[PDB]
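From the methods appendix. Each design record in this collection lists the tokenized structure first, followed by the designed amino acid sequence. Records were kept in a plain field format so they could be parsed without special tools. The example shown here is representative of the layout used throughout.

RECORD:
FOLD TOKENS (251 positions):
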């Protein structure tokens, strides 16, 4: 599609992250209101998730069981909420400096861009032993995504680039995006196409796996977009941060 639609959220203050579950429910970190909201497919009325004590949340992810993971940026922590629960859990990450993005793989491992420590960390489900991924030369990373094979994709915000690291490899590569300006969000779909919010250029770009040729998605009117998600139908959801709204484009 080349016709975007604005999702019927309301009252957002510079939304920062977005995720979409297998039922098409859309989850958004409403950064400036210290809360996370969600909208079921077809619904015209959001609900607020029962997280507590959030300071300007920044990334969100949802797993196949509907558990919602949120980077509680201002409290240097990552929290999660199981489907139907009213009681969040704080994951046992330590030493985080204003975490930004979060991703969760098919094994339930949770990956966090530890923005202010220039690194990416992960915790296997149920573990309290965090691991620092062997990326090198990052500068305040901002988004993270993980594909079906466990390959990790990171927006290396301060270096205007996107890097990738296969599970068990110690050697990252740089994806051949071009002309990015402080990219923020990243998502990877089931085809391995990588989507990036090119924050400083007010646009969203994508790169098919193994291609050297990015394309610009036909969104309109974006103002410093911040997060991107892609559902199983290939619909692309973007937090249009500077316009206080979430937009989507069908495949
Ligand atoms: Zn902002
Ligand atoms: Zn802000
Ligand atoms: Zn902020
Ligand atoms: Zn901040
Ligand atoms: Zn910050
Ligand atoms: Zn920062
Ligand atoms: Zn920063
Ligand atoms: Zn920055
Ligand atoms: Zn920046
Ligand atoms: Zn910026
Ligand atoms: Zn900005
Ligand atoms: Zn901003």
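DESIGN:
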């Amino acid at each position: 599609s080349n016709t975007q639609t604005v999702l019927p959220f309301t009252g957002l203050n510079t939304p920062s992250g977005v995720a979409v579950d297998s039922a098409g429910t859309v989850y958004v970190t409403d950064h400036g209101n210290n809360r996370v909201v969600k909208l079921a497919a077809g619904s015209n009325t959001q609900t607020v998730l029962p997280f507590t004590g959030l300071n300007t949340p920044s990334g969100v992810a949802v797993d196949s069981a509907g558990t919602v993971y949120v980077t509680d940026h201002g409290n240097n922590r990552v929290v999660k909420l199981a489907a139907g629960s009213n009681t969040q859990t704080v994951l046992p990450f330590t030493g985080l400096n204003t975490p930004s993005g979060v991703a969760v793989d098919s094994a339930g491992t949770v990956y966090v861009t530890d923005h202010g420590n220039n690194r990416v960390v992960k915790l296997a489900a149920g573990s309290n032993t965090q691991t620092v991924l062997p990326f090198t030369g990052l500068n305040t990373p901002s988004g993270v995504a993980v594909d079906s094979a466990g390959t990790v994709y990171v927006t290396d915000h301060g270096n205007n680039r996107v890097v990738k690291l296969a599970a068990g490899s110690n050697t990252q590569t740089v994806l051949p995006f071009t002309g990015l300006n402080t990219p923020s969000g990243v998502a990877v779909d089931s085809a391995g196409t990588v989507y990036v919010t090119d924050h400083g250029n007010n646009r969203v770009v994508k790169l098919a796996a193994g291609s050297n040729t990015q394309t610009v998605l036909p969104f309109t009117g974006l103002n410093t977009p911040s997060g991107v998600a892609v559902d199983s139908a290939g619909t692309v959801y973007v937090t249009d941060h500077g316009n206080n709204r979430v937009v989507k484009l069908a495949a």
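APPENDIX NOTE: The chain has one domain: 1-251.
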